[PDB]
Design a protein around this nucleic acid. Structure first.
Ligand SMILES: CN(C)[C@@H]1C(=O)C(C(N)=O)=C(O)[C@@]2(O)C(=O)C3=C(O)c4c(O)c(NC(=O)CN5CCCC5)cc(F)c4C[C@H]3C[C@@H]12
Ligand SMILES: [Mg+2]
Ligand SMILES: [Mg+2]
Ligand SMILES: [Mg+2]
Ligand SMILES: [Mg+2]
Ligand SMILES: [Mg+2]
Ligand SMILES: [Mg+2]
Ligand SMILES: [Mg+2]
Ligand SMILES: [Mg+2]
Ligand SMILES: [Mg+2]
Ligand SMILES: [Mg+2]
Ligand SMILES: [Mg+2]
Ligand SMILES: [Mg+2]
Ligand SMILES: [Mg+2]
Ligand SMILES: [Mg+2]
Ligand SMILES: [Mg+2]
Ligand SMILES: [Mg+2]
Ligand SMILES: [Mg+2]
Lengths: 136, 126, 82, 100, 100, 215
RNA sequence: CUUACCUGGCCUUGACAUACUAGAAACUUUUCAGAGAUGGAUUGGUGCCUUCGGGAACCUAGAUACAGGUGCUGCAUGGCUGUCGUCAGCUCGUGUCGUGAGAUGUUGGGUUAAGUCCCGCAACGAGCGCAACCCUUUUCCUUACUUGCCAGCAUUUCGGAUGGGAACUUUAAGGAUACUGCCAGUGACAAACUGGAGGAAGGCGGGGACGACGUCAAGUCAUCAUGGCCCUUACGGCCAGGGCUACACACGUGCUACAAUGGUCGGUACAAAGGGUUGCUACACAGCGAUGUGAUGCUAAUCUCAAAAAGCCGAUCGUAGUCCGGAUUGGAGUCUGCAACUCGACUCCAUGAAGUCGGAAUCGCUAGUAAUCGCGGAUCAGAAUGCCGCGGUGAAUACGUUCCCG
């Protein structure tokens, strides 16, 4: 903007698990203001993963995001702490969209479970990005 | 016994708070009947949830105007103000939480020559 | 379409000409400007010359025409392609 | 506007005034159920037999100071050109520039 | 069981307030009891007027006119109250309607 | 750029309307048109009476017209015959009885309209525009205005190419809403066409808002 | 109709003004011819003032000065408007300097939205612009208590419905509050900028009006006014039909979709601003429906347009050109209008096109914003996907100034 340090916005923690990571992922899922639908999708996916394996919903999500997070992007440049999280959050929903399970919440839960083991489309995309990073 | 008035985006809420067991009535309805969005219920419950006083009070609330989110915010502001009226020593923690502030954001008016408040018609040089 | 409760519309000055023609057996065409009048059963077997803006075009009324407007048979624009 | 157009509008308004009563009576007769169908048909024919300038649909609102046929504003009976000038001089009561 | 209802309309709230206060003062002086003035919702009419004569569709003036209303009730009226209210003068810009 | 009308922008702030009456939405148009015809008739009839302000009111089924003039005697008449005739004509234009009140102007040099007519008459009588502008600008300042501005546009001296010339003394703060500014316009019809005259007069600032004027 | 255009039919001191002369109240009832404009017949009446001698209004007949022109010139003009651009500039007095025209002030280091402010400095000071004074929104107080309100009482056909209360919401006039005021850094000990407490709100809180000196002989003689030049049995005026809606094509601005974060069906919540007496209409009956008939309340915080829609719960559809999409076409109807052929809107049955997310390129947006959902109004007999407004739900991202534009 040529004259200001415009401050970063502060989004409220989610009303259920009180996690800003879940809040930001919810905002990434939301389209054109349909927060209720985005909330239903994400909260259903989390409940499904919890039922399948009994773990704290927040810990599993943070661990999976850590696996999915890119290191660098192409002269190669190191991305700042927020940009990696944004990229991982985007690619997770992108892969869940192309998944072919019944409902969006269920296929999001399936994608998260696959990424946790490492046999997931998002993890494969990260591997492809890493492979291309060797060009320079 | 104590009273509070809450406002958020054209929604106004009248909250009467008395020492009780935990009943909560909105517009002669019950919380789950009035709000079908669980997030709205949790937003409403935040104040007493913070103070661990859910079972120490009863709530009789009327609300008018706005939409679902606006009415939920107005009810939360009203409950906060009623708690302040009941006791002043609570106000520090409530302010730290952020429930004291009256959110002043409102819709911006549409402007002549524009499609919306800020959105502009598509431009072409040739 | 005009409401059925009001009935079909015919200009009175054209209706009088039609009635006189049918009462007689004059085959002479009836010249009119009423493109908006409805073609009735009494018009069948007659020639009506309908204005199109610059000329009157003759129309011989058949049974299949009943229910149409007079102007439907007198086009007003000329076009032969680009 | 040309003075002929103003005179045409004045003539049409006078014609409508001259026939309002007969027109109302005829339409009432048409809409009267208790009357026989023949009377209603005669009423319809008499209604169609009036001069065309008896129809209010052919009146067009004009400025009132210039005769402009566009931009009328029924409330003031003036067109936009004259309304702007008259308002900005303070000659139209209660009207001010709007900011909200 | 006699109760006088007064309704005031204007395009200027200052003038309407002056008139209403004069009415209340007159009624109180004659000795009746009054309720009001009660402010009713205001009407706002808005207009968009092109400022250019020919082709500048984005160049407009926005005007508004506001109709203000007030309501007053006089109960337990004395004999002199009606005569005093009738004798009260009429001020331009304010319309007064009395209902008995 | 183009500038807003000095009086219109101040109509609700520090200035009053020249028309003060109420009307239902049905009679508004008729009342407005009849008032406009009254203004036209007065403007034509009282050209030589140095009349600037016309204020129309409709108290109750009747009309009161207040005419501000510098020459009250001309409008009133020797025996008061003229006022009765004016009332009769104004009543004919209206549909209700009309009564006229006269307001004498003590300082014609501080009124923008009268100054505008003074300049326009000279320009028609072939007085040099710069001379007329300087004379008016000096007379107003000597009368005691905090500021004045005069502008003349058209074919000055019958030239082929029109131009605009302006002259000012004092201060004229147009952007200050509470500032009291008199404004007027006038046409001077000459052999080569029309020359337009504009006059601003700044007389000081109003403190207290529209309330002080007792609206 | 509008309407300025075309075809044909018509008038000529004219549809409209003033001046002169004569006769008739003005008006008004029924026909005929005609596409109408027009023409020709044809009933009823003798009005308001008079020093009643003649006059007012409004008509008819003659007469010439004249009227009339959306015909040309925006490059002969007034008025009005776009644009750079809400960009930060534009200048004077007194002083000094120069033989001079002129110069300084207004330049330099910072800062700011800003010629905003402080520093320095032969400059010392002031005006128009900036800002502020005006409107609206967020917190609170006073006045007001109906047609709006219902905390406590009661009476309740469980509807503020009634007796009632003046608490609360709200309606709308007047007031209060923010000032870098207090604290810690910071900078030149300045200006200014950072980070804290309080506070509903914190560093011009958020928006709207307000357009400096000037630029493009930029737009408008078709709102209007105006110099000059043109026509006058027509370039003026009256009328019926047609055109402005044409269609091998090319562009700009929009709407609707290509679906599962979705479509359909059943149930069920939550607004704000506007409109309404030649108008909006509760309610009943008829119709599948657009609507029709009867009837009720409203000139409206009183009655009414009115169903908010996205939302929530349940069922089904299971990636198909489909229970996506809704163009086109065939039938049948309603309403407004003298009249829906050219050329209206809307309703029902049937039909079911392109479209699988769009090339080189290119547009808007920094927060209650974008996106998405519905609601209202001016124009208006009828005719919005346009324009001007209203609220509901509610994001992402700015490291930075190299490159592109002003
Ligand atoms: C592309 N086009 C929009 C131009 C454009 O783009 C620009 C721009 N700034 O870019 C503009 O200037 C324009 O729009 C414009 O307005 C112009 C005129 O007025 C004008 C004019 O009036 C006369 N006048 C006469 O010939 C009269 N004579 C008297 C005796 C015989 C004839 C002569 C003349 F050459 C012109 C030039 C135009 C140019 C025009
Ligand atoms: Mg608003
Ligand atoms: Mg919106
Ligand atoms: Mg059809
Ligand atoms: Mg003309
Ligand atoms: Mg029309
Ligand atoms: Mg036409
Ligand atoms: Mg020009
Ligand atoms: Mg300013
Ligand atoms: Mg030009
Ligand atoms: Mg041009
Ligand atoms: Mg025609
Ligand atoms: Mg067109
Ligand atoms: Mg569902
Ligand atoms: Mg479908
Ligand atoms: Mg295909
Ligand atoms: Mg910006
Ligand atoms: Mg309409």
């Amino acid at each position: 903007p040529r004259r200001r340090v415009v401050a970063a916005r502060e989004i409220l923690p989610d009303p259920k698990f009180s996690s800003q990571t879940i809040a930001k992922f919810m905002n990434h899922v939301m389209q054109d203001g349909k927060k209720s639908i985005a909330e239903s999708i994400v909260y259903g996916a989390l409940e499904r993963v919890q039922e399948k394996n009994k773990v704290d919903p927040v810990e599993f999500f943070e661990t999976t995001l850590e696996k999915v997070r890119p290191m660098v992007e192409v002269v190669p440049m190191e991305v700042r702490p927020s940009r990696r999280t944004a990229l991982a959050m985007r690619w997770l929903v992108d892969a869940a969209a192309k998944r072919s399970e019944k409902t969006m919440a269920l296929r999001l839960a399936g994608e998260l479970l696959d990424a946790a083991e490492g046999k997931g489309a998002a993890i494969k995309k990260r591997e492809d990005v890493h492979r291309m990073a060797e060009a320079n | 016994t104590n009273y509070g008035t809450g406002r958020r985006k054209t929604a106004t809420a009248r909250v009467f708070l008395s020492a009780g067991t935990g009943k909560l009535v909105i517009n002669n309805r019950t919380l789950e009947q009035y709000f079908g969005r669980e997030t709205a219920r949790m937003v409403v419950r935040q104040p007493l949830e913070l103070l661990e006083a859910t079972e120490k009070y009863d709530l009789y609330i009327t609300v008018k105007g706005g939409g679902i989110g606006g009415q939920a915010g107005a009810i939360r502001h009203g409950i906060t103000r009623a708690l302040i009226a009941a006791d002043e020593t609570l106000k520090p923690v409530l302010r730290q939480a952020g429930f004291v502030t009256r959110d002043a954001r409102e819709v911006e008016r549409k402007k002549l020559g524009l499609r919306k408040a800020r959105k502009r018609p598509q431009f072409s040089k040739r | 379409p005009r409401s059925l409760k009001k009935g079909p519309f015919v200009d009175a000055h054209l209706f009088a000409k039609v009635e006189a023609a049918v009462a007689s057996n004059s085959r002479k065409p009836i010249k009119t400007w009423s493109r908006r009048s409805m073609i009735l059963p009494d018009f069948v077997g007659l020639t009506i010359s309908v204005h199109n803006g610059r000329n009157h075009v003759p129309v011989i009324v058949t049974e299949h025409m009943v229910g149409h407007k007079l102007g439907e048979f007198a086009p007003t624009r000329t076009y032969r392609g680009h | 506007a040309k003075k002929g157009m103003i005179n045409r509008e004045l003539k049409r308004e006078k014609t409508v005034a001259k026939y309002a009563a007969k027109r109302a009576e005829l339409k009432a007769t048409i809409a009267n159920v208790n009357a026989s169908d023949e009377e209603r048909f005669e009423a319809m024919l008499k209604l169609q037999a009036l001069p065309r300038n008896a129809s209010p649909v052919r009146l067009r609102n004009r400025c009132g100071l210039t005769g402009r046929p566009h931009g009328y504003f029924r409330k003031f009976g003036l067109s936009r050109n004259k309304l702007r000038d008259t308002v900005m001089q303070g000659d139209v009561p209660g009207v001010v520039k709007a900011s909200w | 069981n006699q109760r006088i209802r007064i309704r005031l309309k204007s395009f200027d709230h200052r003038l309407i307030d002056q008139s209403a206060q004069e009415i209340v003062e007159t009624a109180k002086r004659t000795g009746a009891q009054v309720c009001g003035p009660i402010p009713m919702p205001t009407r706002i009419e808005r207009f968009n007027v092109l400022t250019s004569p020919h082709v500048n569709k984005d160049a407009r003036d926005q005007y508004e006119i506001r109709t203000y209303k007030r309501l007053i009730d006089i109960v337990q009226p004395t004999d002199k109250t009606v005569d005093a209210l009738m004798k009260l003068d009429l001020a331009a810009g304010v319309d007064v309607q009395i209902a008995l | 750029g183009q500038k807003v009308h000095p009086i219109g922008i101040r109509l609700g702030v520090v200035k009053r309307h020249n028309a003060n009456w109420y009307a239902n939405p049905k009679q508004y148009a008729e009342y407005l048109l009849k008032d406009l015809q009254v203004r036209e008739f007065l403007t034509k009839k009282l050209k030589n009476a140095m009349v600037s302000n016309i204020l129309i009111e409709r108290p109750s089924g009747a009309a009161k017209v207040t005419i501000s003039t510098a020459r009250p005697g001309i409008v009133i008449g020797k025996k008061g015959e003229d006022i009765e005739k004016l009332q009769r004509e104004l009543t004919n234009i209206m549909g209700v009885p009309a009564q006229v009140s006269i307001n004498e102007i003590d300082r014609p040099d501080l009124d923008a309209r009268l100054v505008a007519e003074a300049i326009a008459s000279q320009l028609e009588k072939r007085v040099m525009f710069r001379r007329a502008m300087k004379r008016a600008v000096q007379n107003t300042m000597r009368a005691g205005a905090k500021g004045i501005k005069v502008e003349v546009s058209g074919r000055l001296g019958g030239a082929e190419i029109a131009r605009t010339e302006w002259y000012r003394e004092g201060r004229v703060p147009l952007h200050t809403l509470r500032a009291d500014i008199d404004y007027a316009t006038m046409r001077a019809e000459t052999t080569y066409g029309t020359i337009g005259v504009k006059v601003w007069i700044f007389r000081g600032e109003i403190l207290g808002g529209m309330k002080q004027v007792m609206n």
